[PDB]
Amino acid sequence: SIINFEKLGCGASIQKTPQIQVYSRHPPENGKPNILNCYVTQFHPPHIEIQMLKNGKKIPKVEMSDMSFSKDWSFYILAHTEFTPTETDTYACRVKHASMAEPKTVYWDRDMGPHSLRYFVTAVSRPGLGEPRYMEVGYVDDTEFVRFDSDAENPRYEPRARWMEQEGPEYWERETQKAKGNEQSFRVDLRTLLGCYNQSKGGSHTIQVISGCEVGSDGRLLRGYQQYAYDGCDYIALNEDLKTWTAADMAALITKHKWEQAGEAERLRAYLEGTCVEALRRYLKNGNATLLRTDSPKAHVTHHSRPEDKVTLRCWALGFYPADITLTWQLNGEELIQDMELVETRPAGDGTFQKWASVVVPLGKEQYYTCHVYHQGLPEPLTLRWEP
């Protein structure tokens, strides 16, 4: 259960460039259906235009995941489309974003315990296009389990996990009405932050919040979060003592003063130690059948013939959950950490993740190199080599 926010009340009177990966869900085999993914990350502002292209032409039915953001405030989103790869068809992803002067086109290259309850809140103004878009997204660990999205005629909280369907109507009604009240606070804060930052009246701006708690197996609060950002930059945050505020900016000092006088840190500490812990306990219980499950990576090495007497070995980890993983290459028992190439871990689109790490090695020396895969789901680390 998310907190009821208090207005920031800053008083009366920033671009990040997207990173893009294009890759298939399953290893491509010509003639057999697959999914092509376009994973776009690390961008701010959240407005973005993603097209997928086949032989230079816009692909019609392209699915878009809901947009999320990470702890560094940057947004991410997965686009995908059904496709059957052929030997000669070219695919690409084209991304248009205010950080870039021209659209970016990225071509598909066949060589491709404690628990936490956190709410990720986004409010984005859209002047001349409608009311601000407001979203509340709840996660137990990294599992999204509830979502409120204002961009609907009769918006309301919806379960994003089957185990939340147990909750009765009184729960959904309470959460929905609280979200609609929260939406109003952020609408007002968006208006007043314009003046506090001496900004023009016609641009889109964003408020982001991370709010929640991390709780140990003994049921004691390990960490509480109440962090705000404006236009992708830190604004104010509750300190680990749950008593004082860090204001990252001159504008936020006005909020800090008001919240001190109003005792907002004590209201937060009570929510965190009370409602937040109790809700997490409740959600962990109903989600017990699925929330603790892990999927171990399946790994294999591919071989790619490079210029002259060098080859690339690529160590793949597929189908794993959660996303945290480590891949290393070894020669003679030493880790080649500085000569590897890696990709950022990326969703397959079915709930599991992919990653690979490659090293360039002398032709004929491939058997001297070992890839190592470290994941919490494995009994012990995987060790593998290239096999013709």
Author numbering: 1 to 13, 24 to 122, 143 to 418
What does the published report state?
MHC Is are heterotrimers consisting of a transmembrane heavy chain (HC), β2-microglobulin (β2m), and a peptide antigen, typically of 8–11 amino acids in length. Major histocompatibility complex class I (MHC I)3 molecules present a diverse array of antigenic peptides, the so-called immunopeptidome, to circulating cytotoxic T lymphocytes. Here, endoplasmic reticulum aminopeptidase 1 (ERAP1) and ERAP2 trim peptides to the optimal length for stable MHC I binding in the final editing step of the antigen processing pathway. The construct consists of SL8 peptide linked with β2m and Kb HC in which the C terminus of SL8 is tethered to the Kb-binding groove through a disulfide bond between Y84C of Kb and a second cysteine within the peptide-β2m linker.
Based on an examination of the native structure of the SIINFEKL (SL8)/Kb pMHC I complex, and the structure of the single-chain SL8-β2m-Kb HC trimer, we introduced alanine substitutions at residues 63, 66, and 167 in the MHC I HC which interact with the bound peptide in the A-pocket. Positions Glu63 and Lys66 interact directly with S(P1) and I(P2) of SL8, whereas Trp167 caps off the N terminus amino group of the peptide. For the W167A-SCT variant the structure and H-bonding network around S(P1) and I(P2) remain very similar to WT-SCT, whereas the space created by the missing Trp167 indole ring is filled by three water molecules. Interestingly, the side chain of N(P4) adopted similar orientation in K66A-SCT, whereas two alternative rotamer states of the N(P4) side chain were resolved in W167A-SCT. Expression of WT (*002) ERAP1 (25) in SCT transfected HeLa E1KO resulted in a significant decrease in the levels of all A-pocket variants detected by 25-D1.16 (∼35–40%). The peptide in both E63A- and K66A-SCT displayed low RMSDCα values (<1.0 Å), whereas SL8 in W167A-SCT deviated more from the initial position, with RMSDCα of ∼2.0 Å. Remarkably, SL8 in W167A-Kb deviated significantly during the simulation and displayed RMSDCα of 6.8 ± 1.1 Å. Examination of the MD trajectory of the untethered W167A pMHC I revealed that the N terminus of SL8 became detached from the A-pocket within 10 ns after equilibration of the system. Partial dissociation of the N-terminal portion of the peptide was observed, however complete dissociation did not occur at this timescale even when the anchor residue F(P5), initially buried inside the binding groove, turned toward the solvent-exposed face of the groove, indicating the strong and preferential binding of the peptide C terminus. In particular, E63A-SCT exhibited the lowest free energy profile, followed by W167A-SCT, both of which displayed the lowest energy barriers at the midpoints of the dissociation path.
